[PDB]
Design a protein around this ligand. Structure first.
Ligand SMILES: CCCCCCCCCCCCCCCCCC(=O)OC[C@H](COP(=O)(O)OCCN)OC(=O)CCCCCCCCCCCCCCCCC
Ligand SMILES: CCCCCCCCCCCCCCCCCC(=O)OC[C@H](COP(=O)(O)OCCN)OC(=O)CCCCCCCCCCCCCCCCC
Ligand SMILES: CCCCCCCCCCCCCCCCCC(=O)OC[C@H](COP(=O)(O)OCCN)OC(=O)CCCCCCCCCCCCCCCCC
Ligand SMILES: CCCCCCCCCCCCCCCCCC(=O)OC[C@H](COP(=O)(O)OCCN)OC(=O)CCCCCCCCCCCCCCCCC
Ligand SMILES: CCCCCCCCCCCCCCCCCC(=O)OC[C@H](COP(=O)(O)OCCN)OC(=O)CCCCCCCCCCCCCCCCC
Ligand SMILES: CCCCCCCCCCCCCCCCCC(=O)OC[C@H](COP(=O)(O)OCCN)OC(=O)CCCCCCCCCCCCCCCCC
Ligand SMILES: CCCCCCCCCCCCCCCCCC(=O)OC[C@H](COP(=O)(O)OCCN)OC(=O)CCCCCCCCCCCCCCCCC
Ligand SMILES: CCCCCCCCCCCCO[C@@H]1O[C@H](CO)[C@@H](O[C@H]2O[C@H](CO)[C@@H](O)[C@H](O)[C@H]2O)[C@H](O)[C@H]1O
Ligand SMILES: CCCCCCCCCCCCO[C@@H]1O[C@H](CO)[C@@H](O[C@H]2O[C@H](CO)[C@@H](O)[C@H](O)[C@H]2O)[C@H](O)[C@H]1O
Ligand SMILES: CCCCCCCCCCCCO[C@@H]1O[C@H](CO)[C@@H](O[C@H]2O[C@H](CO)[C@@H](O)[C@H](O)[C@H]2O)[C@H](O)[C@H]1O
Ligand SMILES: Nc1nc2c(ncn2[C@@H]2O[C@H](COP(=O)(O)OP(=O)(O)OP(=O)(O)O)[C@@H](O)[C@H]2O)c(=O)[nH]1
Ligand SMILES: N=C(N)NC(=N)NCCc1ccc(I)c(Cl)c1
Ligand SMILES: [Mg+2]
Lengths: 50, 19, 48, 459, 112, 140, 320, 347
């Protein structure tokens, strides 16, 4: 019992950006966040670390 | 699902003279 | 935006800005001057 | 260790001075770079540990724990950035700051030479962990969970502080290198019985020991995903790491003081495995699986054999990657259906075929399929426990049977059968989620090629 | 000397290096106070009033230099007092003859 | 207090259990009176009789715990011929907790009282044997 | 120097600035009674500062650039909505009156501060002393609940006690039937919904409680509809008042210093207007509160303290 | 109150404390206490209401009684030593009376009943003086007479203060009464170590004063005196809630914050003296303090309580309070642990 903002809707990241990688709503930032994870996570740490 | 935050019923637990 | 009232800190208080910067400058000079004497007296007392 | 401490501290300015929309990109990219350089700690010698300075040293016990810690930070950032999308910007930067400061305390905890420096950082990890659970948890019960977490830990930690300080008065130093040469035997007496309990009960609560574990399922059900990842992957292993260090100065009293705790562990692992068969909450199930796995680690440390410590080290690393992966998998389901009930969403292999592969791989490691490092650790503990007393093979064997039962039960309940008709918001797995799972499993399986680097100082 | 922050004899000790890591930490505390001062008063935290932020670093460093100087002196005094006492009472601090582990007997506790 | 505690401590354990009960009943009775005095002072009774009635209950209850502990602990020492055993006091401490539960007519309190009083009593015996100091004399 | 104990010590004392013309005047009356016209004309003739009646956006007019802010930053309370549906489920009726009292409380503090610091009198249209007449009118009509009145009286008790009442209480008497007619001539569709019982309750409160109470502590001048029309004849009455009653006779520089300290600190003035009493009509949930507060700091010139926002032209921030 | 009169009285509160701390004569120590009491009563009565009058009366009766036992101890000491020098007393009855006199002045249990009531009944700024500056003079006396203090008496007062301070705070919602029971609990730590290392009594006193001033200054900043009003701070000054959280965690004695330093150093000095049971008991009982500090953090910083509509009017006005030294104090309350060895300056 008070003044409240209702429960917000779930936002499907795919509807606005069908090519979303799930990192960010902005497509350009979403591409960069994918490249750093893959390049540093896989190409550097796992391949050169191994 | 929105994060739960204290409501009036929860907050009134701390409004009394004692706990 | 362009405030309806004059803000209490609308412009710098150049007296405090003068005293603040001067006090920092004074203290730094005093500290290094003190550190010089301390080292020189230390070397003097220790034979260095 | 400055080459790891200083860059970790620099992550804080990087996040705060990063452009508004680059906080997750910048922190993720540079925390991965720090994880890369952490491999330089593998300069380990057969006889002498790697002793950098009066403050920090690194041996083959701390090194794999350090690498697991610095690897976990970028993984935690990826897992958190979706449920924090609507968070206020400055509150985003504070969430990342709590995780960075947790890494800072953890890498210094695992490399402190002296036990009081270890104690202070061992305890400093509470503040960020408590803040993450209570500030960014989701439900009402996150406030109770924070309190049980805080006071279970401190009720054991405070006696440990007294015991450590008393040891320095009598021995003259708490430096771990010094203790190796000045260690004296502990004779029978009630004063020593309570010194033994004071030194060990803080670490027992962290493992956690069966009986003192009821805080852990509370914290896991209430923590945000990143909280659950670090809590399961690394924070549990603070207790094991401390035990492997402090038992050095507790001999031979450990010979008989360990009996009550081995019985709790050996029987406790059977009880907690069986509880997993009847859990309704997917996160609680995975929480109760950690208690079962860490029961093996407690037994291995307490029997003090070269094989048991080698098995103990491998389990802590293997468990860390597996439990963190399981929490991430369950969280990905939660982010869709917004519920932790295991029976709510069924038959997901039909709708998310590649995420069912990750579910399968995580389950296979969890039940210790050979030659995963999950089994190398489990097998070494069973080998040594058999020589401790042959009958233990019965309890050990039963636990493996039950361990497979609930591991595949969870896989069958959530991934197989018929899908739930009315749940119609199961979106295709995001590239972020798929990469998150692979960055768990791929290192875990890669380590089977070179298992020596995770076997510890007694290899 | 009574009610002296730094007695005269402290001058025969080497003064703390201005690059002392503890001093560098004290300067960092001063900087953190300056940022907090901007925050509670809702000013731009990093930029607002650099003249004020500067006096914070200086005052913390200035005060912290002399606290560190007295800290070092008080530990030097402690050691001086302790070593002198050991010299005044040789019979309470005898030099034992150290055996080698080849001679000293220690019980073996098997781990079975 | 020192005198009564000394008498209990300065007689051999497990011998002359009727005396020990005198000492532990006196300690218990005294503690009950101290509680009565503060309770009566800080929580004024409605009448003189209520104030005396409250004092009687607290003093009886505290003294009853004192007698039972000093009796249960000593009888077990002679029975088991283990005079220097903390286990004796654990039984003696628990028996006290049960009485507190009956006088308070609460199994939960009686169950909790046993655990805390039994373990507290067992620790006191260990302290005596090992020389543990509560209020340690300054030494360094 | 900002005002404070040091400035008071050095000579800044209210008795220096004040004179026989340092008076606080309040014009009251029913709706459409001619207050604003009269108050504005009194102020010019006597050379006093005029504060128009404190509306929903009074606070906006004293901070920032002075323009009204979007209504979500005043809680969405609306006068028009009150006339359309005074019995609304959303509690707009009491949220408005609670907001309006706080606005009046802030205007009174500003009015007092102007008088003390410069010595010039002020003219106000209604005040915290007469604001209760709207509360009673709302309650009698069943527009608000008994709990809301209890809350109002709690807030009023711990805030009005700190201040001094007006020297002069000008009141304009216009009976309800004329007030009715004067509303339609205004042509605001929302006001015309006002019932006469509501206007009668307002009149009864003024003549039942306000005027009798203020007579013991202030000078009260009552005027009819036509009497009020000649502002010059109203000023003439003010200029020859005796001023021989009320708490202003007991004020000395020690007391006025303490009073001036309160009114220059607006967060101390408004301290108790937000007491943690959880009425539905004035309670805001965490998510709504947090979301709106984020928007407020995104308004031009609002992120930082005034004088440190360089998105609106502030300079030398690195030396301030 | 006239501003010049307020300054003169405030300087007389300090003058009386200084006299106690520089006096070598018992009579002058007693005079310093009377002067301090005479000047603090008008600061309690400043706002003139029935609660301030009650608090001032209860304070006067307690302080006036304690001063009378102090003078009795001094005269007994003169009888059995023929001198007035401030030092170890020469009569065990004198030591007991002086020790009880100083325990009453400090508000240590079981003489603690006045602290929660007096603190609640006076304004925040007066409570700040009461719980910080007023601890200096009685502690400076204890620092000088500890050789003759009865060990059982002083350690019993320490134990009772920690228990009663810990338990009393659990039931409170008023901030001034939470700070009072926090004060009682912290006094027990200062006196617990006094028989063993007086330097650690000073260390604990200093850090307690810093943290207590930091909390009171932040309560004064938003004019909050209850839990619920304090819970509105997140919707006014979010930064102030983070400072409160950090300071409260420090008062609770959590590493790696400053407030862990006194508990750490006191435990060290007690274990050197083969005192294991007492410091273990003290640390565990201090968990009571951490519990009712943690509740304040939950309702202040780690959750967001319901606000009120009128709160929006406050968004448009800057903080105007002086908040003197708050930036420096909050940093000292939290980030001092790396500089712990600096405690030897107090030696
Ligand atoms: C709990 C708080 C409330 C209860 C009070 C705690 C104390 C009561 C428990 C008994 C503890 C045992 C003890 O008192 O140790 C005394 C003993 C003193 O021996 P000492 O004088 O040093 O002999 C000469 C050798 N230097 O000390 C020693 O010789 C060395 C002992 C090392 C320090 C032991 C610290 C006490 C640990 C008690 C708790 C242990 C269990 C922790 C349980 C946590 C559960 C989560
Ligand atoms: C503190 C920042 C770290 C943030 C994480 C917090 C960690 C836990 C804090 C709790 C208290 C534990 C403090 C542990 C450090 C104190 C021990 C120590 O470092 O002493 C030595 C230090 C000077 O260091 P040094 O002589 O050169 O030898 C080691 C250099 N690696 O002498 C000193 O003590 C002074 C230096 C203090 C260390 C912090 C400041 C480093 C300089 C950067 C200032 C900016
Ligand atoms: C070599 C140094 C490494 C750094 C180590 C930091 C250690 C903690 C230091 C504590 C003091 C932190 C500064 C005090 C808070 C002031 C900053 C703030 O409140 O908000 C962030 C603020 C930006 O927000 P805004 O209000 O818009 O100001 C505009 C200026 N850009 O201003 C900013 O944009 C950035 C200002 C710094 C942000 C501080 C973030 C919080 C730090 C405290 C969390 C705990 C620290 C980690 C604990 C482990 C200790 C190493
Ligand atoms: C324990 C080991 C670690 C070491 C601990 C060290 C702690 C002790 C160190 C000293 C702590 C106090 C230092 C605070 C520095 C901030 C003062 C400042 O920058 O003020 C700037 C200016 C007013 O300063 P201003 O009066 O102009 O200075 C000239 C004096 N003739 O503009 C302003 O308006 C400032 C407003 C904010 C100031 C906070 C409110 C207090 C008022 C302070 C007045 C100035 C104090 C000058 C301190 C100089 C000390 C050398
Ligand atoms: C120095 C030497 C002194 C050693 C003794 C120190 C004890 C000091 C205790 C003073 C504060 C105690 C306050 C308190 O406990 O409350 C009063 C209490 C009332 O208890 P009562 O009313 O009888 O039971 C109600 C059950 N619903 O009354 C009591 O029963 C308290 C008794 C505590 C005795 C210890
Ligand atoms: C080093 C620690 C020093 C800490 C000093 C703390 C500064 C005081 C808090 C500043 C906040 C601004 C303020 O107003 O403080 C309250 C009080 C002034 O009174 P106030 O009612 O607010 O206004 C005058 C109307 N009578 O201000 C006061 O009267 C000051 C009372 C506290 C001073 C003693 C602080 C503890 C002891 C410090 C000495 C340590 C030795
Ligand atoms: C160095 C060796 C010693 C190491 C010891 C540890 C050092 C810790 C020192 C702590 C000193 C306090 C400095 C904390 C600075 C935190 C920065 C901060 O306050 O956040 C910025 C923001 C300020 O808000 P505002 O200025 O009003 O502007 C609008 C922005 N909302 O504030 C906010 O809006 C945030 C609102 C949400 C609140 C979230 C609370 C959870 C985060 C808590 C982090 C701080 C925890 C400190 C405790 C110790 C941590 C180790
Ligand atoms: C050894 C250390 C190595 C560290 C490596 C760190 C890798 C970080 C990769 C992030 C690269 C992003 O680089 C980006 O480039 C352009 C400038 O050309 C900037 O500006 C860009 O912003 C948007 C993104 O919203 C772009 O769509 C747009 O093309 C451009 O305006 C961005 O602000 C910057 O973020
Ligand atoms: C999870 C909780 C686990 C609890 C585990 C409990 C372990 C029980 C250990 C029992 C042995 C304790 O330690 C025991 O103490 C006493 C010291 O007083 C020693 O015995 C010594 O003192 C006792 C005094 O009563 C004498 O009887 C004996 O002559 C003397 O040698 C024993 O040699 C030692 O064995
Ligand atoms: C709160 C109520 C306060 C009421 C105060 C009541 C008056 C207090 C009187 C204090 C003086 C008592 O005097 C007490 O008796 C005799 C005095 O020769 C002393 O007697 C004791 O000490 C002296 C040592 O020289 C010797 O006599 C002997 O070793 C021993 O009997 C005590 O050491 C002393 O403490
Ligand atoms: N509910 C409520 N309405 C108010 C309050 N103050 C003003 N109003 C309304 O604001 C409107 C304009 O104010 P009024 O002065 O009374 O009406 P007017 O047309 O301007 O007539 P004048 O007195 O000459 O200025 C009226 O419809 C009032 O009902 C208040 O405190 N509560
Ligand atoms: N424990 C006591 N009662 N006295 C005390 N505080 N120190 C006594 C010993 C000591 C310790 C540190 C230093 I530096 C110095 Cl010079 C002397
Ligand atoms: Mg009008």
């Amino acid at each position: 019992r008070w003044q409240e903002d209702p429960e917000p809707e779930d936002e499907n990241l795919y509807e606005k950006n069908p090519d979303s990688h799930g990192y960010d709503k902005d497509p350009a930032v979403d591409i960069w966040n994918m490249r750093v994870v893959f390049f540093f996570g896989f190409s550097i740490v796992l391949v050169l670390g191994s | 699902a929105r994060q739960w935050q204290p409501d009036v019923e929860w907050a009134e637990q701390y409004g009394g003279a004692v706990m | 935006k362009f405030y309806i009232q004059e803000p209490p800190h609308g412009s710098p208080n150049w007296l405090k800005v003068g005293l603040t910067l001067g006090t920092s400058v004074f203290l730094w000079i005093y500290l290094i001057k003190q550190h010089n004497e301390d080292v020189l007296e230390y070397k003097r007392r220790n034979g260095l | 260790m400055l080459k790891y401490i200083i860059p970790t501290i620099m992550l804080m300015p990087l996040t705060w001075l990063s452009k508004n929309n680059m906080i997750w990109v910048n922190s993720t990219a540079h925390s991965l770079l720090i994880s890369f350089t952490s491999l330089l700690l593998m300069n380990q010698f057969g006889d002498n540990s790697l002793n950098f300075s009066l403050l920090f040293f690194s041996d083959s016990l701390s090194t794999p724990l350090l690498i697991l810690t610095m690897w976990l930070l970028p993984l935690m950032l990826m897992a958190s950035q979706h449920h924090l999308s609507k968070e206020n910007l400055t509150r985003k930067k504070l969430f990342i700051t709590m995780l960075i400061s947790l890494q800072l305390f953890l890498i210094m905890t695992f490399t402190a030479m002296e036990l009081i420096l270890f104690y202070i950082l061992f305890e400093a990890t509470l503040v960020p962990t408590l803040i993450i659970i209570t500030r960014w948890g989701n439900q009402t019960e996150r406030l109770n969970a924070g309190l049980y977490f805080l006071f279970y830990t401190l009720a054991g930690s405070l006696p440990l502080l007294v015991a450590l300080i008393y040891i320095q008065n009598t021995v003259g130093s708490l430096n771990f290198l010094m203790l190796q040469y000045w260690v004296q035997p502990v004779h029978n007496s009630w004063s020593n019985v309570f010194m033994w309990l004071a030194c060990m009960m803080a670490f027992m609560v962290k493992m956690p020991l069966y009986g003192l574990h009821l805080w852990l399922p509370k914290a896991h059900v209430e923590a945000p995903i990143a909280g659950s990842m670090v809590l399961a992957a690394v924070l549990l292993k603070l207790g094991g790491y401390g035990m492997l260090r402090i038992t050095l100065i507790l001999n031979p009293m450990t010979d008989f003081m360990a009996y009550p705790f081995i019985m709790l562990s050996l029987w406790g692992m059977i009880m907690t495995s069986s509880i997993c068969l009847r859990q309704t909450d997917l996160k609680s199930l995975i929480a109760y699986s950690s208690v079962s796995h860490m029961a093996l680690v407690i037994v291995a440390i307490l029997i003090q054999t070269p094989w048991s410590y080698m098995g103990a080290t491998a389990l802590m690393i293997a468990h860390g990657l597996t439990s963190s992966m399981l929490f991430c998998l369950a969280n990905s389901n939660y982010e869709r259906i917004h519920s932790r009930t295991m029976i709510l969403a069924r038959g997901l292999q039909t709708l998310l075929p590649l995420m069912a592969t990750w579910w399968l791989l995580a389950s296979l490691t969890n039940l210790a399929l050979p030659p995963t490092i999950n089994l190398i650790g489990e097998l070494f503990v069973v080998m040594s426990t058999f020589s401790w007393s042959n009958i233990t093979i019965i309890l050990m064997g039963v636990n493996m049977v039950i361990t497979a039962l609930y591991s595949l039960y969870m896989l069958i309940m959530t991934q197989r059968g018929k899908y739930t008709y009315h749940i119609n918001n199961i979106s295709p797995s995001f590239t972020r989620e798929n990469a998150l799972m692979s960055l768990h499993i791929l290192p875990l399986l890669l380590l089977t090629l070179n298992p020596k680097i995770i076997l510890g100082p007694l290899y | 000397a009574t009610f002296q922050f730094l007695p005269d004899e402290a001058r025969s000790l080497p003064p703390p290096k201005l690059t002392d890591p503890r001093l560098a930490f004290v300067g960092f505390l001063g900087y953190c106070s300056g940022l907090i001062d901007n925050a509670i008063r809702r000013r731009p935290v990093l930029l607002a009033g650099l003249h004020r932020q500067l006096l914070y670093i200086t005052s913390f460093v200035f005060v912290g230099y002399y606290l560190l100087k007295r800290q070092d002196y008080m530990y030097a005094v402690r050691d001086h007092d302790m070593f002198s006492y050991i010299k005044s009472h040789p019979e309470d601090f005898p030099e034992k003859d150290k055996k080698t582990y080849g001679e000293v007997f220690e019980e073996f506790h098997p781990v079975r | 207090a020192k005198t009564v505690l000394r008498q209990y401590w300065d007689i051999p354990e497990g011998t002359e259990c009727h005396r020990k009960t005198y000492a532990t009943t006196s300690i218990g009775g005294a503690a009950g009176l101290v509680v009565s005095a503060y309770s009566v002072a800080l929580k004024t009774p409605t009448s003189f009789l209520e104030g005396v009635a409250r004092t009687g209950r607290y003093t009886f209850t505290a003294a009853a715990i004192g007698a039972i502990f000093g009796l249960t602990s000593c009888i077990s020492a002679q029975v088991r011929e283990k005079p220097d055993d903390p286990l004796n006091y654990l039984i003696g401490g628990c028996a006290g907790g049960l009485i507190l539960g009956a006088r308070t007519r609460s199994y939960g309190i009686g169950a909790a009282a046993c655990a805390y009083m039994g373990l507290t009593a067992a620790l006191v015996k260990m302290g005596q044997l090992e020389g543990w100091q509560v209020f340690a004399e300054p030494k360094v | 120097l900002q005002y404070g104990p040091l400035a008071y010590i050095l000579g800044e004392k209210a008795t220096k600035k004040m004179t026989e013309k340092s008076k606080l005047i309040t014009v009251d009356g029913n709706i459409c009674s001619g207050k604003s016209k009269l108050a504005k004309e009194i102020a010019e003739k006597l050379g006093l500062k005029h504060f128009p009646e404190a509306g929903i956006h009074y606070v906006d007019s004293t901070t920032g650039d002075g323009k009204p802010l979007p209504v979500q930053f005043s809680g969405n309370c609306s006068l028009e909505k009150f006339y359309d549906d005074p019995k609304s489920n959303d509690g707009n009726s009491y949220r408005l009156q609670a907001w309006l009292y706080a606005s009046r409380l802030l205007q009174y503090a500003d009015a007092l501060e102007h008088l003390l610091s410069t010595g010039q009198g002020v003219v106000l249209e209604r005040s915290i002393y007469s604001d209760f007449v709207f509360l009673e009118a709302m309650y009698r009509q069943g527009f608000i609940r008994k709990q809301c009145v209890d809350h109002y009286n709690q807030v009023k008790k711990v805030t009005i006690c700190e201040y001094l009442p007006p020297h002069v209480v000008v009141y304009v008497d216009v009976p309800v039937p004329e007030v009715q007619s004067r509303i339609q001539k205004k042509g605001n569709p929302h006001e015309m919904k006002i019932t006469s019982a509501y206007l009668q309750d307002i009149e009864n409160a003024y003549k039942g409680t306000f005027l009798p109470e203020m007579s013991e502590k202030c000078e009260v001048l009552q005027y009819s509809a036509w009497e009020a029309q000649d502002a010059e004849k109203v000023v003439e009455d003010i200029e020859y008042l005796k001023y021989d009653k009320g708490p202003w006779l007991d004020q000395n520089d020690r007391k006025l210093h303490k009073l001036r300290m309160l009114v220059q600190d607006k967060l101390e003035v408004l301290n108790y207007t937000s007491i943690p009493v959880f009425l539905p009509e004035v309670t805001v949930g965490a998510h709504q509160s947090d979301q709106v507060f984020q928007e407020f700091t995104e308004l031009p010139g609002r992120k930082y303290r005034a004088g440190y926002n360089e998105d609106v032209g502030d300079k030398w921030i690195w030396l301030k | 109150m006239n501003p010049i009169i307020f300054i003169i009285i405030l300087l007389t509160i300090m003058l009386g404390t200084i006299i106690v701390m520089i006096s070598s004569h018992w009579l002058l120590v007693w005079i310093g206490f009377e002067m301090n009491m005479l000047a603090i009563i008008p600061i309690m009565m400043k706002n003139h209401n029935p609660r301030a009058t009650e608090a001032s009366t209860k304070y006067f009766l307690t302080q006036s009684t304690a001063s009378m036992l102090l003078m009795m101890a001094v005269i007994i000491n003169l009888m059995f030593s023929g001198q007035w020098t401030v030092m170890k007393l020469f009569n065990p009855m004198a030591s007991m009376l002086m020790t009880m006199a100083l325990a009453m002045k400090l508000g240590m249990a079981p003489f603690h009943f006045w602290v929660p009531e007096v603190t609640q009944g006076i304004p925040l700024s007066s409570g700040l003086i009461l719980l910080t500056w007023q601890k200096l003079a009685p502690m400076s006396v204890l620092y000088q007479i500890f050789p003759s203090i009865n060990l059982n008496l002083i350690l019993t007062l320490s134990v009772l203060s920690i228990l009663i301070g810990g338990w009393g705070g659990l039931n409170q919602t008023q901030l001034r009464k939470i700070m009072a029971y926090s004060s009682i609990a912290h006094m027990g730590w200062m006196t617990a170590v006094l028989p063993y290392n007086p330097t650690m009594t000073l260390l604990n006193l200093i850090i307690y004063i810093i943290m207590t001033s930091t909390m009171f200054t932040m309560f004064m900043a938003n004019s909050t005196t209850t839990t619920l009003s304090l819970s509105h701070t997140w919707n006014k000054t979010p930064i102030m809630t983070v400072l409160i959280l950090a300071t409260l965690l420090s008062m609770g004695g959590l590493p790696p914050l400053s407030g862990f330093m006194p508990k750490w150093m006191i435990i060290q000095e007690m274990t050197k003296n083969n005192s294991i049971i007492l410091p273990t008991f003290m640390a565990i009982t201090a968990l009571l303090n951490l519990y009712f500090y943690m509740r304040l953090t939950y309702s202040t910083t780690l959750t967001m309580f319901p606000s009120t509509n009128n709160m929006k009017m406050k968004w448009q006005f800057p903080l105007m309070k002086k908040m003197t030294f708050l930036p420096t104090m909050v940093v000292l309350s939290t980030m001092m642990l790396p500089l712990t060895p600096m405690l030897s300056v107090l030696e």
